[PDB]
Design a protein around this ligand. Structure first.
Ligand SMILES: Nc1nc2c(ncn2[C@@H]2O[C@H](COP(=O)(O)OP(=O)(O)OP(=O)(O)O)[C@@H](O)[C@H]2O)c(=O)[nH]1
Lengths: 73, 843, 70, 79, 267
RNA sequence: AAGCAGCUUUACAGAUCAAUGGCGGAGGGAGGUCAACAUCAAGAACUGUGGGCGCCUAUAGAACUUAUAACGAACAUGGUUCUUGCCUUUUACCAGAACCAUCCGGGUGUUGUCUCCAUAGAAACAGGUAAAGCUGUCCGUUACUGUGGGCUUGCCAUAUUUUUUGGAACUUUUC
């Protein structure tokens, strides 16, 4: 299947991890291991923030996915 | 600045993959690579690069429709009017290019495409020095002929990675009309035939050092790629790579069952033929002979391919291409085998050593890089450089050096200049670059002022590193000049321009060796007819516009001895006796091959820098070389070996160890000149028999004194030695269809070189390769007597390898036997002719 | 799978390994494995009291690997 | 998969990463793997405490990596 | 399907149509396939053979184009006694590397060099030879996956042989799609005075070859590039209005009406 | 490469039978030894004019390149000037060089048509240029279902060390 996962491509996402951090940004690539690639990223540890840039997360570390906004023009 | 770049935008016809992504991958050392490409004449090199270029750009404008389909093949990397009117690549041209692999991860690559013509081997030389690996490309018809042997020998001798591409398979099937089993033993046969010439390894279809192609039809096979594109979607992904290894080399699957057993059951052709040659033949013979729709259903069904009624409607050939170029995809199989076949860690130190003294010292911390070639693109002239250490930007002031001045080994040692501009080579176009990174090859601007020919570049802040860094040899141009033509400007007032004209050539053409005589008449040395022709055209058109004047083709003789003695200073405080000796044809043949002494091979005489016990170990061991002489061996030359041989040497040993510079400097002075023609001396051993030295030497012993003395001692040395006159010989490669052999014989006789040295049949073709010898001075207009006489059949190449020098048939001094002018000279008396003649342009 | 790691350059040389539980070992690198199991000779613990042992370190545990001398 | 290729493409550039250990490493990346092994040079480690260190050559195990952070030019790269 | 339409422009075909056609035409056409055969019989060696005034044995002999051979100077350079005489230095050389032997070349077009020496084999004797036939004159030298096109049993087809024979043809045949030409626009015999005479000829027909190469060069050397956008074909215009009307007829008859027609007008 | 599902359509029964949204259509096909009027090697870059919102498109002039790789895998004659000729001169040539012509053709576009053919129709209306659904309205199926076609798809199936069959669970102190 994986038909739904392609639909998320190029949307701003809110990804919560097992570590607790929540990464935010557009989705450039997705994988068979669930490796996610994110553009212009910001972790939110908690009134807190940090600028990373391009981030490639592992599959083990990811918990859930949630859309922030529609696909950008 | 950037706006003028924008008016550059509409020039370079952009590309699929854009740039800054590629040029972004640039700085990364381990990526990119350098690939040089060489084959003999008409291997398809330049065309192959044409393939890659179209696998790159979308937009390439200058394609006519007429070329798009078909019939006339595109030349891109043939940028010159000269190349385009001739039909053979002359000045090698690359394209810096980004390509991808089967695994899709793209390497930056530097493509270099060399001439194949033997006379131009010079650039292939240069090509080597840059190239991290070469693709040696073969016309499937001639297999590997001698020139190829010399090639691989050279590249391995440069410690550089290889891969092979056998090419023009189309020519095989269509022209030669091979039953498949003919073809398989063809391919095989060649592959063994080459592996024989492959020292310390073997290649093999699965070794992926062998890649199949035809350019004119534009298709490529690496069985990895090939199968993957197709059979991969068939069978479980486990067995696959095994199945690759299951392909070439006598292996059979009867039904789904791989068995090396003879072929039993019934049908017999090996697995290779089974999934490659035959189905291919079906592609050709059908797409020619088959109803389109029949093909179509096979294109979906088997190959998942779709024809457009346009592509449906084509004359047989252009169709047939679009067929293949459609069935196979943007060849990465090539790249892919390249991709995996180069080892940075293993060989990088090998090659990077081969061109200098290894070290290594000063890793990073520095800019030091190797300058090969001064080149002429559409605008003016750039320089071609490979980057070993450091970065570069426009305007950066940097220090300059040349390879001879690195033969020399603080202040004053460096002329320096800034990088005026940096390009990348885009073939017909040049792609501007501000920043240059380690490992990638680029063009510079403004540095042409600095030098001629090969030049080492560096910029370093550390006199530590400065002392520590090393310097590249003067590049070995794999064939020596050997061809001689006197130039005069037709209007001697025009004389100045011609000079700078010549100057630029000595830059733009590596191998040419130019002189200005005492008499004033300029001299040119080049490989052969064609080569120096290309010069003369670029000379009467490009640079100088001056109508000039040209001699008869000429050679460059040499001066030797076939086996008493005095010498005298004009202030006889010196007493010199130096006789001369002919020398070992064994040591001759080993001096001809200049090596690092690897293996039982007699070490190159450079290895006198290795221990004279080590050198004299090679000597005494291999030659029966006299142990005393081996300890008495003093110096080598541009030429033979000099020995201090006498007891009075030991009588006055320190006196000698003071003046040895005077000895040898005077002696290099000697053998460079000569007694007879003032032409080089070869095959001559000087045992130094007697010396006395001015009385108590109060600035009495001087180089001014002893040098021209020992000069004479050498001269008379040869003169009493029964001197003969050395000549070179072009080693001849001739390619013919069989029945014409008698013809060739005739011509050989008349040319008096007349040496049919070997005769050869070519596997599975109606071809004879004949190998022979003909003297350079007798080599005028040979090739066209061939090409006419055989009605275009056959083919001729005159190459100078092994540098073999025969004897001039005459006796050096006999005055009478001559017969008057305006005739070819009588074969019994020559050397007198030649020598008196040159002397008349000399003394 | 089984990408044979780049420990060819460490063979017959000293190391300063780090492992799970913040424990570390010195040794001459003898041999390596698919899963990165290691063979060390002249093995010395680093508690700062150094005990001589003589050793096969397991792959999973490994955090990293250092070189003492250039 | 694309999430692996991106990694291979940042070989040579300078990279930041986070491990299950809790520490982050910053340095030029030399070799990678399909497993997600790493080999870096001139690394500047920074644990939970803030303790800085220098490691000449360093290895990882992919399983232990949480997330990598790669150079900016690698957004124009081909997918 | 076989052509445009009644305006008859722009023909087209299929293979055996050709292969037959070719087979029939071949007696009329004996022409050496490869360019490499022609060497000093090409165009550019004729030009250069003109601008430099050289005489090729099978090439036509022209006028100087540069009137003056006259400047002759001995000099330290030129002297016979400083020049080494071996080999004749035939003219053909001076047509080969014209910047080499023939000094001061002017308006000289740089010739082609070296083609591959076509090894193509063909059977002009036995046509029962199969498609792929090792020539006598060559040197001696799970079960469910399969090869792809081997699905079809045999590659050799009844056409494919002559598909090969047509893979090499001079311009007309190798193309199966092209357009229409005036009858006189076709030149049949131009091929034959481009060829070597060999030997057995009399000097009559040989000298004739030299004539027709001469004329041929001249017909080549002067292109034009006009355009008539002004002139509608004289017929089309003049057939307008009255005094002329259109019909059909037998050819010979119209011939006759003309015979008395202009016969009158002479009178 | 079968089947399932998804996507696109489709003959469709359909929701709506509204506002919608998509694709096409608001002047067909082909062929006319049918004509009229234009135009005609290609390409980057400079200048001028016009149109549309500094950019894009068209036309004219100048420079450079292409092998003059070729409007025609065709070539015929004439004129002026320079070398050639000779005596003759003409007809005129000869034999070249240059520069000008003419003639025989070819291709493209537009327009008007002629022949054989095509089946919905919404081919309906109003705006203008050198051009057109170019624009605005507009209508055909239709935007959400089930039967029928094709694929651009699932990438094709791994609980035992580097991701999806868990080293987790739990407690306590500090700010
Ligand atoms: N039969 C056949 N001939 C080919 C093919 N590809 C190239 N050629 C021939 O190769 C010749 C030109 O070779 P190029 O690739 O252009 O240049 P080259 O092979 O490197 O020769 P050089 O450049 O002088 O070294 C042409 O005569 C082509 O006919 C091919 O695929 N099949």
């Amino acid at each position: 299947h994986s038909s739904r996962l392609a639909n998320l491509i190029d949307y701003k996402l809110r990804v919560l991890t097992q570590d607790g951090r929540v990464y935010i940004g557009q989705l450039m690539a997705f994988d068979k291991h669930m490796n996610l690639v994110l553009n212009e990223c910001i972790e939110e540890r908690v009134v807190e923030k940090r600028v990373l840039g391009l981030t490639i997360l592992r599959g083990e570390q990811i918990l859930s996915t949630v859309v922030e906004d529609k696909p950008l023009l | 600045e950037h706006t003028i770049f924008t008016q550059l935008k509409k020039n370079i016809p952009k590309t699929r993959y854009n740039r800054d992504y590629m040029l972004s991958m640039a700085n990364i050392p381990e990526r990119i690579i350098n690939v040089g490409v060489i084959g003999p004449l008409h291997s398809g090199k330049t065309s192959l690069m044409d393939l890659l270029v179209i696998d790159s750009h979308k937009r390439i404008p200058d394609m006519s429709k007429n070329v798009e389909l078909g019939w006339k093949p595109l030349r891109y990397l043939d940028n010159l009017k000269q190349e385009i009117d001739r039909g053979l690549s002359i000045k090698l041209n690359g394209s810096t290019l980004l390509c991808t692999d089967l695994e899709s991860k793209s390497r930056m690559i530097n493509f270099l495409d060399a001439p194949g013509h033997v006379n131009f081997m010079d650039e292939t030389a240069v090509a080597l020095a840059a190239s991290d690996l070469v693709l040696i490309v073969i016309d499937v018809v001639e297999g590997v002929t001698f020139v190829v042997e010399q090639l691989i020998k050279q590249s391995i001798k440069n410690n550089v990675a290889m891969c092979f591409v056998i090419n023009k398979l189309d020519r095989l099937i269509l022209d030669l009309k091979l039953p498949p089993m003919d073809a398989y033993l063809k391919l095989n046969h060649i592959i063994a035939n080459i592996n024989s010439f492959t020292k310390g390894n073997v290649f093999s279809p699965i070794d992926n050092n062998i890649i199949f192609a035809s350019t004119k039809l534009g298709f490529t096979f690496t069985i990895k790629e090939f199968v993957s594109y197709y059979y991969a979607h068939s069978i479980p992904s486990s067995k696959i790579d095994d199945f690759t290894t299951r392909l070439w080399g006598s292996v059979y699957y009867h039904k789904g069952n791989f068995r090396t057993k003879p072929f039993e059951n019934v049908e017999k052709y090996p697995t290779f033929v089974e999934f490659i040659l035959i189905p291919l033949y079906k592609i050709f013979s059908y797409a020619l002979s088959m109803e389109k729709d029949k093909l179509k259903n096979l294109l979906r069904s088997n190959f998942r391919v779709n024809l457009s009624q346009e592509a449906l409607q084509y004359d047989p050939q252009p169709f047939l291409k679009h067929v293949l170029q459609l069935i196979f995809r943007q060849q990465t199989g090539l790249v892919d085998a390249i991709t995996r076949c180069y080892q940075p860690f293993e060989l990088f130190d090998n090659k990077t050593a081969h061109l200098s003294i290894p070290g290594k010292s000063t890793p990073e911390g520095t800019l030091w890089a190797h300058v090969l070639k001064t080149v002429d693109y559409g605008g003016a002239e750039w320089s071609l450089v490979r980057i070993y250490s450091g970065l570069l930007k426009r305007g950066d002031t940097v220090r300059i050096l040349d390879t001879s001045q690195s033969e020399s080994r603080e202040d004053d040692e460096t002329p320096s200049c800034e990088v005026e501009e940096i390009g990348l080579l885009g073939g017909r176009y040049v792609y501007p670059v501000h920043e240059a990174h380690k490992g990638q090859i680029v063009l510079i601007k403004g540095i042409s002022s600095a030098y001629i020919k090969s030049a080492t570049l560096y910029s370093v802040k550390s006199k530590e590193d400065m002392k520590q860094l090393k310097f590249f040899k003067p590049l070995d141009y794999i064939t020596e000049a050997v061809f001689k033509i006197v130039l005069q400007p037709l209007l001697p007032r025009e004389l100045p321009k011609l000079l700078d004209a010549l100057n630029k050539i000595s830059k733009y053409y590596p191998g040419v060796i130019i002189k200005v005589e005492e008499s004033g008449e300029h001299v040119i040395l080049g490989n052969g007819e064609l080569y120096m022709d290309c010069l003369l055209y670029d000379l009467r058109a490009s640079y100088a516009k001056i109508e000039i004047k040209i001699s008869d083709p000429l050679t460059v003789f040499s001066e030797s001895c076939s086996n008493s003695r005095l010498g005298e200073e004009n202030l006889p405080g010196l007493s010199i006796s130096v006789a001369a000796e002919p020398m070992d044809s064994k040591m001759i043949q080993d001096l001809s091959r200049n090596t690092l002494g690897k293996g039982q091979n007699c070490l190159d005489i450079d290895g006198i820098m290795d221990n004279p016990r080590k050198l004299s170990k090679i000597l005494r061991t291999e030659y029966g070389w006299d142990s005393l002489a081996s300890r008495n061996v003093w110096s080598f030359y541009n030429g033979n070996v000099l020995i201090n041989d006498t007891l009075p040497d030991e009588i006055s040993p320190e006196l000698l160890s003071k003046y040895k510079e005077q000895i040898i400097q005077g002696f290099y002075w000697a053998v460079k000149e000569g007694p007879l023609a003032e032409e080089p001396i070869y095959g001559v051993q000087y045992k130094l028999l007697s010396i006395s030295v001015p009385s108590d030497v109060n600035i009495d012993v001087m180089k001014s004194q002893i040098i021209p003395l020992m000069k004479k001692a050498c001269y008379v040395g040869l003169l009493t030695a029964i001197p003969i006159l050395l000549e070179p010989i072009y080693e001849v490669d001739i390619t013919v269809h069989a029945p014409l052999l008698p013809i060739v014989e005739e011509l050989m006789k008349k040319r008096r070189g007349s040496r049919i040295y070997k005769t050869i049949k070519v596997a599975g073709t109606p071809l004879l390769e004949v190998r022979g010898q003909v003297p350079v001075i007798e080599s005028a207009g040979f090739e066209t007597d061939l090409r006419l006489s055989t009605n275009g059949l056959g083919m001729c190449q005159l190459y100078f390898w092994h540098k073999i020098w025969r004897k001039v048939p005459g006796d050096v001094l006999d005055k009478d036997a001559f017969i008057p002018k305006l005739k070819p000279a009588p074969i019994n008396s020559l050397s007198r002719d030649f020598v008196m003649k040159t002397r008349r342009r000399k003394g | 799978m089984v990408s044979t790691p780049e420990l060819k350059k460490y063979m017959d040389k000293k190391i300063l390994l780090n492992i799970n539980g913040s424990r570390k070992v010195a040794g001459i690198l003898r041999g390596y494995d698919i899963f990165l199991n290691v063979v060390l000779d002249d093995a010395m613990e680093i508690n700062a009291n150094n005990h001589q042992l003589g050793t096969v370190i397991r792959g999973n545990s490994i955090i990293s690997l250092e070189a003492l001398d250039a | 998969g694309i999430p692996v290729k991106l990694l291979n493409e940042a070989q040579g550039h300078i990279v930041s990463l986070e491990l299950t250990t809790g520490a982050t490493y910053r340095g030029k990346l030399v070799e990678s793997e399909d497993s997600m092994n790493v080999q870096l040079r001139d690394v500047i480690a920074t644990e939970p405490q803030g303790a800085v260190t220098h490691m000449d050559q360093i290895f990882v195990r992919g399983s232990q990596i949480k997330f990598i952070v790669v150079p900016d030019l690698l957004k124009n790269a081909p997918l | 399907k076989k052509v445009n339409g009644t305006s008859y422009k722009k023909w087209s075909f299929d293979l055996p149509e050709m292969s037959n056609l070719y087979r029939l035409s071949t007696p009329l056409r004996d022409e050496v396939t490869d360019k490499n055969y022609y060497y000093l019989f090409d165009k550019k060696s004729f030009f250069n053979g003109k601008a430099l005034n050289n005489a090729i044995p099978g090439g036509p002999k022209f006028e100087p184009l540069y009137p003056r051979e006259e400047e002759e100077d001995y000099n330290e350079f030129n002297s016979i006694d400083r020049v080494i005489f071996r080999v004749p230095i035939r003219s053909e050389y001076k047509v080969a590397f014209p910047h080499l032997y023939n000094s001061r070349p002017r308006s000289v077009r740089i010739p082609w060099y070296n083609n591959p020496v076509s090894c193509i084999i063909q059977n002009d004797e036995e046509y029962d030879t199969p498609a792929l036939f090792f020539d006598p004159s060559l040197n001696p030298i799970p079960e469910d996956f399969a090869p792809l096109l081997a699905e079809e049993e045999e590659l050799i087809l009844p056409n494919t042989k002559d598909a090969m024979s047509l893979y090499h043809s001079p311009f007309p045949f190798n193309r199966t799609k092209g357009k229409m030409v005036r009858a006189q626009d076709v030149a049949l015999a131009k091929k034959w005075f481009l060829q070597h005479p060999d030997e057995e000829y009399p000097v009559k027909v040989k000298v004739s070859y030299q004539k027709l190469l001469k004329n041929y060069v001249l017909n080549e050397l002067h292109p034009t590039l006009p355009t008539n956008h002004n002139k509608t074909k004289l017929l089309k215009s003049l057939k307008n209005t009255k005094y002329f009307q259109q019909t059909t007829i037998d050819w010979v008859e119209a011939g006759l009406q003309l015979c008395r027609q202009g016969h009158n007008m002479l009178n």
